[PDB]
Amino acid sequence: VNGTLMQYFEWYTPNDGQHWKRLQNDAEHLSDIGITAVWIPPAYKGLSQSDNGYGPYDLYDLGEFQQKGTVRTKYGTKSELQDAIGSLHSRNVQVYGDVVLNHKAGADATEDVTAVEVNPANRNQETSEEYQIKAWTDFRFPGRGNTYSDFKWHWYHFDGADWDESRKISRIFKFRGEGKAWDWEVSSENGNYDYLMYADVDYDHPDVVAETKKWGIWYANELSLDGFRIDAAKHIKFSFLRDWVQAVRQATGKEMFTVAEYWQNNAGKLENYLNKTSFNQSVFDVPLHFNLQAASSQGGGYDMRKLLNGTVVSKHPLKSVTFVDNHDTQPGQSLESTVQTWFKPLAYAFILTRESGYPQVFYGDMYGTKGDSQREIPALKHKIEPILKARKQYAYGAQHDYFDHHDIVGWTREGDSSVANSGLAALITDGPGGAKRMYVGRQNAGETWHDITGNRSEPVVINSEGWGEFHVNGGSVSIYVQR
């Protein structure tokens, strides 16, 4: 059966501490609709209870130690998360944990550090003489003590930070120590993009490297994780991420599927990351997201024949996780670039019914986003579920592509003899509707097919040769399958 990932959170998921309970409760629904793996938000204690997890304070605190004035994380307690995972597993759904290793946030105290400022546009350039700062680098874990790990962090485990408590100024500070330098290889944007936010981990420090691998193995074993989602990969030494994934696989003996968030609309840079990590991990198909977003925003003017241009799925399908939107691209967020609602079902058809790539459904698209703009994403589950059913029950067999018109494009799947009544014919259009003759396999001759989305009520009969004349409404999607 085809695999389908679900990102199970959005930016505005509530800080009610009930998200793991929500997931546990949704396990049956997710398995029923065909989700086979869930990517959960960072599960460890952030700089505050309300942090989404991307400002992690203590990786070893999964919502079980009193730190930051709370036991639970934003999402709930450790036991609640373990219950959610147990429910998913009972329904043959896997769980991928989010791994936030770039930086640490929320230090317990400052320390005196010799530092230099660097150019924000070229971090390889020092722009001040050395001076003393007070940086937030002492991480002591007062509520955990030595439980699980007696490692304590200090300035020297980091390459830099962006705040000096002495002068109360925000700059990119690079620390001075013994052979300190920004890590390589990382994205070359801004000269060296090792530094992003908070206190940047130094992946040159041998103790840090060993400790982080130890943590990775611990985290997998503690939650019985089936794989990982790596946050902010372009800001972390690539050979380190390569080795870290391998270390966890060696210890567990498990596949440990991993997808990295390498946030760059550049297929060539994404391919470089794949090479530098020995093709041991997938990447999100950032270019495809941007293409889909472009099509959704040009009011019909986008050349739909070009949807696959420059995408990772077109070049390294087996290493691509395709997606429509995420918590960073949703309205009001840092990488805001939302696929417009009218086009969203078309985009889901594109990632869920095509043969290549590992598609990811976004919780915010299914259930809606709860931000404060007058342009939040509505709950589109009623439009995505039919497309998920198309994936689960019909998207099998040989695929034929029809990227042959500036608005109306489509593809078919012939079905597989081992999946009863499988096969489909999909059409999408960014402009006025119309028709397209497409081949669905001579073995489907004479069959009555119908649009599983309900957008069109008229059935299509496959002729004696395996060709059907399919129809799509304007700015819409139709996916035809056996009646």
Binding site residue list: 102, 159, 181, 183, 194, 200, 202, 204, 235, 300, 302, 406-407, 430
Pairing verdict, β 227-230 and 257-260: parallel
Q: What is the per-residue binding string for Ca ion in 175-204, x denoting contact by CB under 5 A? A: --------x----------x-----x-x-x
The footprint of Ca ion on residues 74-133 (CB under 5 A) is: 102
Phi/psi-derived region of residue 169, left when phi > 0, alpha when psi is between -120 and 50, beta in every other case: beta
Tell which one of 226, 243, 376, 407 touches Ca ion (CB under 5 A): 407
Residue pair 139/153 in contact by the 8 Å Cβ criterion? yes
Stretch that binds Ca ion, among 5-13, 79-87, 117-125, 154-162 (CB under 5 A): 154-162
Q: Quick one: what does residue 444 bind among Na ion, Ca ion, none, with the CB cut-off 5 to 8 Å set by partner type?
A: Ca ion
CB proximity list for 299: less than 8 A, separation 6 or greater: none
Q: How many CA atoms lie within 13 A of 51 on its CB side?
A: 24
Query: Is 184 or 439 the residue whose CB approaches Na ion more closely?
Result: 184
- What is the phi/psi pair of residue 242, to 5°? -60, -55
Residue pair 277/238 in contact by the 8 Å Cβ criterion? yes
Q: Is 231 a catalytic residue?
A: yes
The footprint of Na ion on residues 178-217 (CB under 5 A) is: 183, 194, 200, 202
Minimal distance, residue 159 CB to Na ion, in Å: 4
Minimal distance, residue 402 CB to Ca ion, in Å: 14
The footprint of Ca ion on residues 427-446 (CB under 5 A) is: 430-431, 444
Asked whether the bond before 185 is cis by omega within 30 degrees of 0, the reply is yes
Q: Quick one: what does residue 64 bind among Ca ion, Na ion, none, with the CB cut-off 5 to 8 Å set by partner type?
A: none
Collapse the DSSP code of 144 into the 3-class scheme (helix H, G, I; strand E, B; otherwise coil) and give the result.
coil
Minimal distance, residue 162 CB to Na ion, in Å: 13
Which residue of the set 58, 117, 261, 376 is catalytic? 261
Residue pair 101/201 in contact by the 8 Å Cβ criterion? yes
Tell which one of 159, 162, 243, 285 touches Na ion (CB under 5 A): 159
Query: Rounded to whole angstroms, how far apart are CA atoms 5 and 388?
Result: 11
Which residue of the set 26, 64, 98, 231 is catalytic? 231
Q: Is 336 a catalytic residue?
A: no
Pairing verdict, β 131-138 and 109-119: antiparallel
Stretch that binds Ca ion, among 9-17, 81-89, 111-119, 227-235 (CB under 5 A): 227-235
Query: Is 177 or 300 the residue whose CB approaches Na ion more closely?
Result: 177
Residue pair 12/328 in contact by the 8 Å Cβ criterion? no
Give exposure, 6-30, as e/b (b: 16+ Cβ within 10 Å). bbbbbbbbebebbbbbbbbebbeeb
In this chain, which residue has its C-beta nearest to Na ion? 159
Which residues are catalytically annotated? 231, 261
Binding residues for Ca ion, per CB under 5 A?
102, 159, 183, 194, 200, 202, 204, 235, 300, 302, 406-407, 430-431, 444
